[PDB]
């Protein structure tokens, strides 16, 4: 028993972390096969970030302007190209540690593990969620850029995030591995508006099921409700409206605990209007939304990876 | 910026996880050099756990009774011995992936990363703390036994924990790598009393400094206090009494934020007597105690490992 905010083992990703330097800027890079991926603002100085013209900047850089170091091994850059917001430094040596991988673009609400690095060396690992406003609440210091987020599906590593910036508000923005930002953000040092952040309702439900599975049942109540009437209350407290797909995704957690999805909603509804009144759920005084129904099934059944 | 409950990268530990089977029991083992370490109750059936005589049980087992599988590689057991509560299966092949390691016995309040495994394969990783009552609040399902806790000091892996049991209360008990239990626990299926759990006061202070560093300063107050008068209040709310060593350990966090240790205490004192009144600190509605002063310095300065 027990419930913890668990991250994926990072071994397969550690071996892909390289350090990328260009001029006086140095950040992390992802070495897969014979190509190194990294944020394009590695070609920018501190001054350039205010208003950079990436084409004109990249055009004054040749292959020998990039120093890609993997521990102590040096990679010879043989080609370079800009794909959206990322750089693709084609090197001469294919990473012998290249795992079976895949590039994916996740949806808000989804969760993944971040391996925070500095100078191409692992600092630590944590689990987090993609907020409905396309930002993430992580832990990044200067130099962390290029750090990746990933999920593990058995023997396959899915890369879904690459860190690019911290916003003046302290939250983080990044891209997928093809270089497209998540959200309305641009890679420049300017004021950027992140929309209103909402609570991931489907995740909160999955977490209540985890609580029930783990012995916390005090919030279970007699009442029930309808999807429409639940959503009306959800919207007042800035929760994401729940759909039928959410109802179906929770099916397994429903069958296992013998508590219908709509009944669980009725317990949530009441916690929003009344609060937790000094009580906790799985050691928490707040409603947790960084666990997807899949994350709960995984932790509760003991799934493993290659 | 930002603060996350961060775990150490697990790559170096993943390569030491083997599956140990004996009879119909199968749990995880730690393969270092040419020796596999695992809980001795791997030689026990379900019936035996009620009242096991480990010597008499071990005596009816020969080297060929142990099946140690590392992925697909099979290890030939050439020797076996019981050291306190762990088994030491000497095999023929030294793990080529043996990292630079060390065995240590931590103190309550200290923190470490747990790599949860099932069948010798990594499931996930999380950070946690050794409670003052020598238990840990983790996430373990049947089959998890043998999972290890560790810290990373640059290029050296310090193994400090090995999971052995879940208590009827849902908390976890284990040993160091020499086989000595943490706490008054024995490896048998009986009712065991874990003492009163207290809050790790020094860790809570380090976390308040992290909050200040990250912009949350609302709890900073004019008052001050004395160590004695603070401790008197601490003891009423089940907090560990603070000593001078704790004061010295926080020195660096004190110099960096310009807030004296005793003044920080005065802010804590007030939060205990008054509560957080609907407010949060680093996204939390409770006082967090799973971060040591060292963990905070690490996350706030960007430390890396081999």
Coordinates of C-alpha atoms in Angstrom, one line a residue, chain A residues 1-12 14 115-118 121-129 137-141 166 170 172 280 283-286 290 298-306, chain B residues 1-12 14 115-118 121-129 137-141 166 170 172 280 283-286 290 298-306:
Chain A
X1 CA 0.0 0.0 0.0
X2 CA 0.9 3.6 0.1
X3 CA 0.8 6.4 -2.5
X4 CA 3.8 8.5 -3.7
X5 CA 4.3 11.0 -6.5
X6 CA 6.5 8.7 -8.5
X7 CA 8.7 9.4 -11.4
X8 CA 9.9 7.0 -14.1
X9 CA 13.4 5.4 -13.7
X10 CA 15.8 7.7 -15.6
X11 CA 18.6 5.4 -16.6
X12 CA 17.7 5.3 -20.3
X14 CA 20.8 9.8 -18.6
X115 CA 15.3 14.9 -15.7
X116 CA 16.9 18.2 -14.6
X117 CA 20.4 18.7 -15.9
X118 CA 23.2 21.2 -15.8
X121 CA 25.0 16.0 -16.3
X122 CA 21.9 14.7 -14.3
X123 CA 20.9 16.7 -11.3
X124 CA 17.6 15.1 -10.3
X125 CA 14.3 13.7 -11.4
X126 CA 10.7 14.5 -10.7
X127 CA 7.1 13.8 -11.9
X128 CA 4.9 16.7 -13.0
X129 CA 1.9 17.6 -15.2
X137 CA 5.4 24.2 -12.5
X138 CA 8.9 22.8 -12.3
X139 CA 12.3 23.3 -10.7
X140 CA 14.8 24.8 -13.2
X141 CA 17.8 27.1 -12.6
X166 CA 11.2 30.5 -17.3
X170 CA 8.2 31.7 -12.3
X172 CA 8.0 27.1 -17.3
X280 CA -6.3 15.3 4.7
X283 CA -1.4 13.0 3.5
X284 CA -2.6 16.1 1.6
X285 CA -4.6 19.1 2.7
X286 CA -5.4 20.0 -1.0
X290 CA -0.9 15.5 -11.0
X298 CA 0.3 1.8 -12.7
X299 CA 1.2 2.5 -9.1
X300 CA -1.6 0.3 -7.7
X301 CA -0.9 -2.8 -9.9
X302 CA 3.0 -2.6 -9.9
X303 CA 3.8 -2.1 -13.6
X304 CA 7.5 -2.4 -14.6
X305 CA 9.6 -1.4 -17.6
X306 CA 12.6 -2.8 -19.6
Chain B
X1 CA 13.2 29.0 -9.7
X2 CA 10.6 26.6 -8.5
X3 CA 10.7 23.8 -5.9
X4 CA 10.0 20.1 -6.4
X5 CA 10.3 17.0 -4.3
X6 CA 13.2 15.7 -6.3
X7 CA 14.7 12.2 -6.4
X8 CA 18.3 11.2 -7.5
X9 CA 18.8 10.0 -11.1
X10 CA 18.5 6.2 -10.8
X11 CA 20.6 5.0 -13.8
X12 CA 23.5 3.7 -11.6
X14 CA 18.9 0.2 -12.2
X115 CA 13.8 2.7 -6.6
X116 CA 10.7 0.5 -6.4
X117 CA 11.1 -2.8 -8.3
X118 CA 9.1 -5.9 -9.1
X121 CA 12.8 -4.7 -13.0
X122 CA 12.4 -0.9 -12.1
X123 CA 8.9 0.3 -11.6
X124 CA 9.5 3.9 -10.4
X125 CA 11.5 6.3 -8.3
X126 CA 10.7 8.7 -5.4
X127 CA 12.3 10.7 -2.7
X128 CA 11.3 10.1 1.0
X129 CA 12.5 10.5 4.5
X137 CA 5.9 6.2 4.3
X138 CA 6.4 4.7 0.9
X139 CA 4.7 3.0 -2.0
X140 CA 5.3 -0.8 -2.0
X141 CA 3.1 -3.7 -3.2
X166 CA 4.9 -3.5 5.4
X170 CA 0.6 0.5 6.2
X172 CA 7.3 0.4 5.9
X280 CA -0.1 27.8 1.2
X283 CA 2.0 25.1 -3.2
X284 CA 1.4 23.2 0.1
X285 CA -1.3 23.6 2.8
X286 CA 0.9 21.7 5.3
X290 CA 10.9 15.7 3.8
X298 CA 21.4 21.2 -3.7
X299 CA 18.1 22.1 -5.5
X300 CA 18.8 25.9 -5.1
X301 CA 22.4 25.8 -6.4
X302 CA 22.1 23.1 -9.2
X303 CA 24.4 20.3 -8.0
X304 CA 25.1 17.5 -10.4
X305 CA 26.5 13.9 -10.3
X306 CA 28.7 11.7 -12.4

